[PDB]
Write a protein that binds this ligand. Structure first.
Ligand SMILES: C[NH+](C)c1cc(NC(=O)CNC(C)(C)C)c(O)c2c1C[C@H]1C[C@H]3[C@H]([NH+](C)C)C(O)=C(C(N)=O)C(=O)[C@@]3(O)C(O)=C1C2=O
Ligand SMILES: [Mg+2]
Ligand SMILES: [Mg+2]
Ligand SMILES: [Mg+2]
Ligand SMILES: [Mg+2]
Ligand SMILES: [Mg+2]
Ligand SMILES: [Mg+2]
Ligand SMILES: [Mg+2]
Ligand SMILES: [Mg+2]
Ligand SMILES: [Mg+2]
Ligand SMILES: [Mg+2]
Ligand SMILES: [Mg+2]
Ligand SMILES: [Mg+2]
Ligand SMILES: [Mg+2]
Ligand SMILES: [Mg+2]
Ligand SMILES: [Mg+2]
Ligand SMILES: [Mg+2]
Ligand SMILES: [Mg+2]
Ligand SMILES: [Mg+2]
Ligand SMILES: [Mg+2]
Ligand SMILES: [Mg+2]
Ligand SMILES: [Mg+2]
Ligand SMILES: [Mg+2]
Ligand SMILES: [Mg+2]
Ligand SMILES: [Mg+2]
Ligand SMILES: [Mg+2]
Ligand SMILES: [Mg+2]
Ligand SMILES: [Mg+2]
Ligand SMILES: [Mg+2]
Ligand SMILES: [Mg+2]
Ligand SMILES: [Mg+2]
Ligand SMILES: [Mg+2]
Ligand SMILES: [Mg+2]
Ligand SMILES: [Mg+2]
Ligand SMILES: [Mg+2]
Ligand SMILES: [Mg+2]
Ligand SMILES: [Mg+2]
Ligand SMILES: [Mg+2]
Ligand SMILES: [Mg+2]
Ligand SMILES: [Mg+2]
Ligand SMILES: [Mg+2]
Ligand SMILES: [Mg+2]
Ligand SMILES: [Mg+2]
Ligand SMILES: [Mg+2]
Ligand SMILES: [Mg+2]
Ligand SMILES: [Mg+2]
Ligand SMILES: [Mg+2]
Lengths: 50, 111
RNA sequence: ACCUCGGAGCAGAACCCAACCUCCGAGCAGUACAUGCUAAGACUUCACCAGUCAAAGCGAACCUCAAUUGAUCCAAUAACUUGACCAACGGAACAAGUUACCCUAGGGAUAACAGCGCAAUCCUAUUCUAGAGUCCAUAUCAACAAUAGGGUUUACGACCUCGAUGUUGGAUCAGGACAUCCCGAUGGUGCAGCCGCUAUUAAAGGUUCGUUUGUUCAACGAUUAAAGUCCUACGUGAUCUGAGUUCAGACCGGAGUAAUCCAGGUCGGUUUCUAUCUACUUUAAAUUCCUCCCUGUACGAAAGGACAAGAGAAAUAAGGCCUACUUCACAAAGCGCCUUCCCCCGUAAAUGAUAUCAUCUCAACUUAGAUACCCACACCCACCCAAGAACAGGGUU
RNA sequence: GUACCCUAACCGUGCAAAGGUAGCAUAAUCACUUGUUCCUUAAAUAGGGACCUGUAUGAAUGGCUCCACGAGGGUUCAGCUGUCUCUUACUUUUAACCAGUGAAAUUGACCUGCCCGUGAAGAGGCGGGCAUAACACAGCAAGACGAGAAGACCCUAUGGAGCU
RNA sequence: ACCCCUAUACCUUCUGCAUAAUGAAUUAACUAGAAAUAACUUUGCAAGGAGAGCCAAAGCUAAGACCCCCGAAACCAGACGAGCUACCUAAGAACAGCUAAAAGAGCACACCCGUCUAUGUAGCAAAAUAGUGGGAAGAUUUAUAGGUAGAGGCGACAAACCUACCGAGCCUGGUGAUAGCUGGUUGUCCAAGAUAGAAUCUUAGUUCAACUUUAAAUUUGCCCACAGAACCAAAUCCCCUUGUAAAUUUAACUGUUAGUCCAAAGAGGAACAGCUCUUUGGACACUAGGAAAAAACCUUGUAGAGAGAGUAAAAAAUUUAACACCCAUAGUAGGCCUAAAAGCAGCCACCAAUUAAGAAAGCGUUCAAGCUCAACACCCACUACCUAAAAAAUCCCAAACAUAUA
């Protein structure tokens, strides 16, 4: 999202162009377990959003 | 970790025990249900766990009928009086069409 | 951490359906006092036990809730009835630690080492062009992100091995990859020269000695052209070591009532094997540094300061020999002496079409671009030998 | 909380039975740890001296010095030497050959090769290729997951035993 | 006879073994299924039967036919052991030489022990040899008898030693201890035969169910037509025809209940794993052909002989980047801002002369200046394929071949 926002904002003409997202903000939670942790012991905590 | 406990209960084995067109005897349970999915109709009684049993012996028929609750059922009457005009509520009902007559008159004496 | 019961998802629509899967709850409360008796027919938590609904009838009247629970024996009671967080919840009437002093039966059904699978982690290359680089994306570095590869780390899995696949470093001998540390060739530069940085090609040859530490590593001293990165059962213990690490003894600090223990430190501590089979046991083209001159030349304001060509001197490696020196003495050796010869491909140019210019050309085309050793062969009884384990070989005029 | 950092002679508060005293101190000592400084060496994670709530030292769980002693552990001057740079020569045993006597572990059968791949995941025996007359003797230890010992580590068993 | 072609020993264990997992040198001999309750079959008699007892709403009596082997560490009882060793008792013995003459003193023999190294490791030796060491007038060493014994003794505590494996001696007996664990289990031939789950000091086992087997009795069993199954996707349930021949019940039991890949729907993990967990369906644990070897992918199943034939699945294709030429005066250093910012630092506007040039699209300048593009003319004509890598470790890996009619 930051790559797209920065590249489009740099490259556009703010006097004759306009840009909108057709994709919502990151909402689906992606979870990761601790590093070096064996298999099992419950589901890992929420890491980020996609 | 795994702080989620419980949820180890088995399936209730509920549902339809007698489908459409099945010959049924008096007292046979037609359906078992946690909520009122199928409603009692003609010659079908309801037991206090909302179970459906055949009050008479015959053929099980599943129909779709209008729903008029008892005027003492407060939640249902509130839903009805909050239903817009021109709309009739529908439910699925279970009936037993009785197969035999109640009895016969036959000769027993020649007095 | 959990152990029993219920609801929702996974499991979308008859039933059922797991995970140390995702959430929410339960171990009651309230009403009634016919919450009395009895009896067709059914359902059923995949067995059983247990649990659930109920027509009619007798007698009266005219239960809500989702789970809301515990068997048998036995105990209390005249009787009816009532007794466990028996919660490890199908419940043994009542029993904890520790073992490195340990033992047995097994298990690669199961961990440690190794291999294997995977690539989260780690490493590399490319794409994109923000940014840094006085300016300038692309001399050099490089964000967000993308694409691909590698199998050196830390993991993860538990697939061979527990009727043994012996272990960390070191010695010895090294085989290989190139992602090249040096030596070779080339392109670019923010390359004047010397030095550098970056990229292409190149695995023939080489890649030091010491102090501390068991160390791999790491720090330091002195060099060198350089002191490469890895794989090889973290190469190699039937070739070696045993400093470390995880047997039995002991001490210190801590834990524990104690036995005893510590993924903490310290002192000590048995490393067996007569090789059956495979494999193998003599394959002659050497590299590098330094000195001189070129030359204080090119270059450069100066300071600094080459590359080619050539000459010499070494060192290592390979092969060999004893004239002297030395260990020594009819001889074997080095600390001594002698000899050691080919290229290597990245690219830079000329002519010239497709495309009547130009263009180094996956256009036709032009240029840079081995010899040596060995080689005959029933004299053989025997003897000698610089030849040799035996055999074989050479000499015996 | 209080004297620029550090640190409190000092003040306040709470608990205990008492709140670690003298002495020593980076230890034969949990992590930090190769603590900081000086000597020793060209170079020191070694050794000695010093500082040090040692945030887990400490007084018959004996604390701290000191004289002798120690096949105890560590450091070191000088000398010595094949310990090594870097190995060589000789003698004896062993060895090899001839003669006499003559075992043991081991052994499914073997007419018992190399590379790459495959496969119960590391092949002499499978697939593709390569190599290939037969047979002794000496030597080597890379392989036969070589021999030995129903793993000395780990787990399991409603298997044991010792101790508290 | 070899040379050709084909062919991955056996048993056990396991999801799966050529496996580099177990056992086996070989021969001969020896070496491992014992029985009841019931049932079934065949007789005898029959409302009774059996040579008392017992059973009997066709039963009773008799026979047949069904249930292994080896192995612990252990526990207990009674004996035997202190000729080794631990300690003690009785009465004995030995200790050269030197220092100094006193010493659990020093050097050092005999003697006792065993620090370190080397050899040896089925050895000379079930702990030795060689050198080097500690002590050697004492808490010393040693000969002879005697004593303390295992629920113990003894111990300058090493949980040491007690007749060459002492965390509790050895022997005999209970004892053919026990083993949910490993190993083994011996003639021929045929047939049926593959894994939902629940409890459990249970997940290495067992019981019930499920599946499987046999013998009987009976009638429906699978595939399924329409209609039917709830509010908050693939499909399934039910189901008459139809095609077929199985199904249910009764009686008797064993065994399986430690599971692997592939396709699909998901969950966990990294939208890792030959990873783990459910479900549906295959295959494997049974044959054969193919994908190189090959478990799980594809083809195919019911068994024999044949020197017959038709077929099934079944052999990888791809090779990429040329792009113009010629020309350019000028209203103006448009205005504002700034020291200047001149087309090009930032703003407003974007007109306008030549035939034809943006109040300028990139560069480039402190600013300037400069050079390319868009523009005239020029002319054959914009010629326009719209695409894109590489690495590892013993030695590349069939040989090859573009062209003779499916
Ligand atoms: C080889 N040594 C260092 C050793 C090591 C371990 N532990 C290991 O296996 C550790 N190895 C690792 C590092 C984990 C790979 C060990 O476990 C052992 C032993 C030694 C033996 C000695 C045994 C001895 N016998 C059998 C030769 C013996 O007679 C006695 C005795 N004193 O009587 C033993 O103590 C002995 O049986 C023993 O206990 C040993 C080990 O257990
Ligand atoms: Mg549930
Ligand atoms: Mg369940
Ligand atoms: Mg049931
Ligand atoms: Mg009634
Ligand atoms: Mg339980
Ligand atoms: Mg239970
Ligand atoms: Mg100990
Ligand atoms: Mg054992
Ligand atoms: Mg591993
Ligand atoms: Mg910039
Ligand atoms: Mg598994
Ligand atoms: Mg093992
Ligand atoms: Mg073996
Ligand atoms: Mg290269
Ligand atoms: Mg290794
Ligand atoms: Mg080896
Ligand atoms: Mg031991
Ligand atoms: Mg010692
Ligand atoms: Mg050895
Ligand atoms: Mg062999
Ligand atoms: Mg002493
Ligand atoms: Mg002989
Ligand atoms: Mg196989
Ligand atoms: Mg192989
Ligand atoms: Mg083999
Ligand atoms: Mg040989
Ligand atoms: Mg072995
Ligand atoms: Mg075993
Ligand atoms: Mg058990
Ligand atoms: Mg027990
Ligand atoms: Mg017992
Ligand atoms: Mg297995
Ligand atoms: Mg084995
Ligand atoms: Mg085998
Ligand atoms: Mg085994
Ligand atoms: Mg005695
Ligand atoms: Mg004395
Ligand atoms: Mg003495
Ligand atoms: Mg004693
Ligand atoms: Mg002790
Ligand atoms: Mg002890
Ligand atoms: Mg037995
Ligand atoms: Mg069959
Ligand atoms: Mg259990
Ligand atoms: Mg078991
Ligand atoms: Mg699996």
């Amino acid at each position: 999202f930051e790559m797209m926002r920065l590249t489009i904002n740099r490259s556009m003409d703010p006097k004759n162009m306009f840009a909108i997202w057709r994709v919502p903000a990151p909402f689906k939670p992606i979870t990761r377990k601790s590093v070096g942790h064996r298999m099992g012991g419950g589901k890992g905590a929420i890491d980020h959003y996609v | 970790s795994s702080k989620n406990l419980g949820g180890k209960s088995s399936g209730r084995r509920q549902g339809i025990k007698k489908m459409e067109g099945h010959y049924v005897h008096a007292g046979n349970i037609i359906a078992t249900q946690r909520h009122f999915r199928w409603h009692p109709g003609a010659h079908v009684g309801v037991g206090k766990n909302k179970c459906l049993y055949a009050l008479e012996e015959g053929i099980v028929r599943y129909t779709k009928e209008v729903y008029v609750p008892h005027p003492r059922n407060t939640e249902a009457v509130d839903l009805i009086t909050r239903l817009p005009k021109g709309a009739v509520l529908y439910k699925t009902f279970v009936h037993v069409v009785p197969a035999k007559p109640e009895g016969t008159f036959k000769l027993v004496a020649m007095l």
